[PDB]
Design a protein around this motif. Structure first.
Motif, PDB file in Angstrom:
ATOM      1  N   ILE A   1       0.837  -1.195   0.000  1.00  0.00           N
ATOM      2  CA  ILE A   1       0.000   0.000   0.000  1.00  0.00           C
ATOM      3  C   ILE A   1       0.871   1.244   0.000  1.00  0.00           C
ATOM      4  O   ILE A   1       0.684   2.158  -0.812  1.00  0.00           O
ATOM      5  N   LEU A   2       1.849   1.288   0.901  1.00  0.00           N
ATOM      6  CA  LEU A   2       2.780   2.406   0.940  1.00  0.00           C
ATOM      7  C   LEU A   2       3.747   2.399  -0.234  1.00  0.00           C
ATOM      8  O   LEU A   2       4.382   3.426  -0.496  1.00  0.00           O
ATOM      9  N   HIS A   3       3.858   1.280  -0.952  1.00  0.00           N
ATOM     10  CA  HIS A   3       4.818   1.182  -2.047  1.00  0.00           C
ATOM     11  C   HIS A   3       4.514   2.199  -3.141  1.00  0.00           C
ATOM     12  O   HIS A   3       5.426   2.845  -3.672  1.00  0.00           O
ATOM     13  N   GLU A   4       3.239   2.360  -3.491  1.00  0.00           N
ATOM     14  CA  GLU A   4       2.859   3.338  -4.500  1.00  0.00           C
ATOM     15  C   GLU A   4       2.643   4.733  -3.926  1.00  0.00           C
ATOM     16  O   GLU A   4       2.295   5.647  -4.680  1.00  0.00           O
ATOM     17  N   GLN A   5       2.833   4.918  -2.623  1.00  0.00           N
ATOM     18  CA  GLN A   5       2.721   6.235  -2.014  1.00  0.00           C
ATOM     19  C   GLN A   5       4.012   7.038  -2.091  1.00  0.00           C
ATOM     20  O   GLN A   5       4.034   8.187  -1.637  1.00  0.00           O
ATOM     21  N   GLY A   6       5.075   6.476  -2.658  1.00  0.00           N
ATOM     22  CA  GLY A   6       6.382   7.094  -2.582  1.00  0.00           C
ATOM     23  C   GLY A   6       7.147   6.776  -1.321  1.00  0.00           C
ATOM     24  O   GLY A   6       8.066   7.522  -0.964  1.00  0.00           O
ATOM     25  N   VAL A   7       6.795   5.695  -0.633  1.00  0.00           N
ATOM     26  CA  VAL A   7       7.400   5.357   0.652  1.00  0.00           C
ATOM     27  C   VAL A   7       8.599   4.449   0.411  1.00  0.00           C
ATOM     28  O   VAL A   7       8.513   3.477  -0.346  1.00  0.00           O
ATOM     29  N   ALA A   8       9.723   4.766   1.057  1.00  0.00           N
ATOM     30  CA  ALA A   8      10.951   4.012   0.823  1.00  0.00           C
ATOM     31  C   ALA A   8      10.923   2.663   1.533  1.00  0.00           C
ATOM     32  O   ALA A   8      11.062   1.615   0.894  1.00  0.00           O
ATOM     33  N   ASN A   9      10.748   2.667   2.852  1.00  0.00           N
ATOM     34  CA  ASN A   9      10.818   1.449   3.661  1.00  0.00           C
ATOM     35  C   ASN A   9       9.568   1.329   4.520  1.00  0.00           C
ATOM     36  O   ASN A   9       9.562   1.726   5.693  1.00  0.00           O
ATOM     37  N   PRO A  10       8.485   0.787   3.963  1.00  0.00           N
ATOM     38  CA  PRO A  10       7.277   0.570   4.771  1.00  0.00           C
ATOM     39  C   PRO A  10       7.471  -0.412   5.913  1.00  0.00           C
ATOM     40  O   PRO A  10       6.691  -0.379   6.873  1.00  0.00           O
ATOM     41  N   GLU A  11       8.474  -1.290   5.842  1.00  0.00           N
ATOM     42  CA  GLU A  11       8.715  -2.221   6.940  1.00  0.00           C
ATOM     43  C   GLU A  11       9.168  -1.504   8.205  1.00  0.00           C
ATOM     44  O   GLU A  11       8.898  -1.978   9.315  1.00  0.00           O
ATOM     45  N   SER A  12       9.854  -0.373   8.063  1.00  0.00           N
ATOM     46  CA  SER A  12      10.417   0.351   9.194  1.00  0.00           C
ATOM     47  C   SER A  12       9.503   1.449   9.715  1.00  0.00           C
ATOM     48  O   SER A  12       9.880   2.162  10.649  1.00  0.00           O
ATOM     49  N   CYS A  13       8.313   1.605   9.134  1.00  0.00           N
ATOM     50  CA  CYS A  13       7.452   2.712   9.531  1.00  0.00           C
ATOM     51  C   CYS A  13       6.878   2.517  10.929  1.00  0.00           C
ATOM     52  O   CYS A  13       6.739   3.488  11.680  1.00  0.00           O
ATOM     53  N   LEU A  14       6.551   1.286  11.301  1.00  0.00           N
ATOM     54  CA  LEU A  14       5.961   1.020  12.603  1.00  0.00           C
ATOM     55  C   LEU A  14       7.007   1.151  13.700  1.00  0.00           C
ATOM     56  O   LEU A  14       8.132   0.661  13.567  1.00  0.00           O
ATOM     57  N   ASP A  15       6.628   1.822  14.787  1.00  0.00           N
ATOM     58  CA  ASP A  15       7.487   1.931  15.953  1.00  0.00           C
ATOM     59  C   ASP A  15       7.133   0.832  16.939  1.00  0.00           C
ATOM     60  O   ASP A  15       5.993   0.800  17.430  1.00  0.00           O
ATOM     61  N   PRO A  16       8.053  -0.081  17.251  1.00  0.00           N
ATOM     62  CA  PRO A  16       7.742  -1.132  18.233  1.00  0.00           C
ATOM     63  C   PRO A  16       7.478  -0.606  19.630  1.00  0.00           C
ATOM     64  O   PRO A  16       6.894  -1.330  20.445  1.00  0.00           O
ATOM     65  N   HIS A  17       7.885   0.620  19.937  1.00  0.00           N
ATOM     66  CA  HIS A  17       7.730   1.179  21.272  1.00  0.00           C
ATOM     67  C   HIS A  17       6.394   1.875  21.473  1.00  0.00           C
ATOM     68  O   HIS A  17       6.162   2.435  22.549  1.00  0.00           O
ATOM     69  N   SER A  18       5.511   1.848  20.472  1.00  0.00           N
ATOM     70  CA  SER A  18       4.256   2.588  20.551  1.00  0.00           C
ATOM     71  C   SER A  18       3.374   2.124  21.703  1.00  0.00           C
ATOM     72  O   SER A  18       2.496   2.876  22.137  1.00  0.00           O
ATOM     73  N   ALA A  19       3.585   0.913  22.207  1.00  0.00           N
ATOM     74  CA  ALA A  19       2.810   0.416  23.333  1.00  0.00           C
ATOM     75  C   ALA A  19       3.393   0.815  24.680  1.00  0.00           C
ATOM     76  O   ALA A  19       2.778   0.528  25.713  1.00  0.00           O
ATOM     77  N   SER A  20       4.550   1.469  24.698  1.00  0.00           N
ATOM     78  CA  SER A  20       5.209   1.856  25.938  1.00  0.00           C
ATOM     79  C   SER A  20       5.379   3.357  26.090  1.00  0.00           C
ATOM     80  O   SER A  20       5.212   3.882  27.192  1.00  0.00           O
ATOM     81  N   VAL A  21       5.710   4.061  25.016  1.00  0.00           N
ATOM     82  CA  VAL A  21       5.927   5.510  25.094  1.00  0.00           C
ATOM     83  C   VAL A  21       4.612   6.197  25.449  1.00  0.00           C
ATOM     84  O   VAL A  21       3.564   5.847  24.879  1.00  0.00           O
ATOM     85  N   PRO A  22       4.605   7.148  26.384  1.00  0.00           N
ATOM     86  CA  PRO A  22       3.368   7.883  26.675  1.00  0.00           C
ATOM     87  C   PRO A  22       2.878   8.631  25.446  1.00  0.00           C
ATOM     88  O   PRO A  22       3.667   9.165  24.665  1.00  0.00           O
ATOM     89  N   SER A  23       1.560   8.673  25.285  1.00  0.00           N
ATOM     90  CA  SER A  23       0.948   9.205  24.078  1.00  0.00           C
ATOM     91  C   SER A  23       0.551  10.663  24.262  1.00  0.00           C
ATOM     92  O   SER A  23       0.058  11.059  25.323  1.00  0.00           O
ATOM     93  N   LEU A  24       0.771  11.457  23.217  1.00  0.00           N
ATOM     94  CA  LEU A  24       0.320  12.841  23.192  1.00  0.00           C
ATOM     95  C   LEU A  24      -1.198  12.894  23.277  1.00  0.00           C
ATOM     96  O   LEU A  24      -1.893  12.176  22.552  1.00  0.00           O
ATOM     97  N   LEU A  25      -1.714  13.744  24.156  1.00  0.00           N
ATOM     98  CA  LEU A  25      -3.133  14.052  24.117  1.00  0.00           C
ATOM     99  C   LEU A  25      -3.448  14.791  22.826  1.00  0.00           C
ATOM    100  O   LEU A  25      -2.572  15.404  22.211  1.00  0.00           O
ATOM    101  N   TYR A  26      -4.704  14.717  22.398  1.00  0.00           N
ATOM    102  CA  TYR A  26      -5.080  15.401  21.171  1.00  0.00           C
ATOM    103  C   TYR A  26      -4.940  16.907  21.343  1.00  0.00           C
ATOM    104  O   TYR A  26      -5.281  17.462  22.391  1.00  0.00           O
ATOM    105  N   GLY A  27      -4.427  17.566  20.310  1.00  0.00           N
ATOM    106  CA  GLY A  27      -4.174  18.983  20.336  1.00  0.00           C
ATOM    107  C   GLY A  27      -2.790  19.354  20.814  1.00  0.00           C
ATOM    108  O   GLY A  27      -2.302  20.438  20.476  1.00  0.00           O
ATOM    109  N   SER A  28      -2.139  18.480  21.573  1.00  0.00           N
ATOM    110  CA  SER A  28      -0.781  18.733  22.017  1.00  0.00           C
ATOM    111  C   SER A  28       0.192  18.484  20.871  1.00  0.00           C
ATOM    112  O   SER A  28      -0.196  18.124  19.756  1.00  0.00           O
TER     113      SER A  28
END
Lengths: 138, 135
Positions: free
Chosen positions: B50-77
């Motif tokens: 899907i990202l291949h035709e978007q001009g994306v170089a490495n779609p495999e590396s886009c996901l951050d494995p730490h997304s379940a641990s890093v505190p999340s920005l509240l909306y608007g911040s």
């Protein structure tokens, strides 16, 4: 391919009698294909369990197998002493060969600004919205 | 069950860098489950193509494995010297266990009329639209 679905409903339920139509203008097949499809829909458990809570006495006899033989009403026309079927809503569907398991369904927008009788015609081939999808010629 | 999806996009791309967030406040699972899910997505060839035709170089590396641990920005911040992510689309999904293969997806209507910060909160359980689905 883009496939459009239309559901025209009876204006009112007379003596407990109701109905609706399903129109697929762009999709094109043979009469035998339509007969096979109609035979298939009669045995669909999902449709039946949908209909049971709707007050349907006999879901199995709800589908008319003669739908592949009877010439179809143009939109807005009606039978003698019968009100025209009023269009309830129309859905558009996008189907691709790459991902057969992904089936999106969405309502058509600005339907009231379009030539309904032209688009809903089964044999029409110049519809601005509904486009002819030529399937296998059985 | 009802599942809501939200997509806050970066306002613009700098030097060929883009980003966005996918938020699921309704879902409630364990952190180990979230890590497993993130591991699963990192090898999804469909998203990569899907990202291949978007001009994306490495779609495999886009996901951050730490997304379940890093505190999340509240909306608007935002981050310092960084414009906040702008909400582009908002989706709601209906899940029925009787028919797992039927997946209705519909955009939410009039999202601008609702308290986006309140609803999009990952830890809130009183969302007017987002309902707490305990998994």
């Amino acid at each position: 391919h883009k496939i459009h679905f239309f559901f025209t409903l009876k204006p009112e339920a007379v003596q407990g009698k109701y109905g609706f139509h399903v129109l697929i203008p762009g999709l094109k097949m043979a009469a035998s294909t339509k007969k096979s499809i109609i035979a298939s829909l009669q045995h669909d458990a999902t449709v039946q369990k949908i209909l049971h809570e709707q007050g349907v006495a006999n879901p199995e006899s709800c589908l008319d197998p003669h739908s592949a033989s009877v010439p179809s009403l143009l939109y807005g026309s009606s039978k003698l002493n019968h009100r025209p079927y009023q269009l309830k809503t129309g859905f558009e569907l996008v189907f691709d060969s790459s991902d057969p398991d992904y089936i999106p369904i969405h309502q058509i927008k600005n339907i009231e600004s379009y030539n309904l009788v032209s688009e809903l015609s089964l044999t029409n081939e110049q519809g601005s919205l509904v486009r002819p999808v030529y399937c296998a010629a059985d």
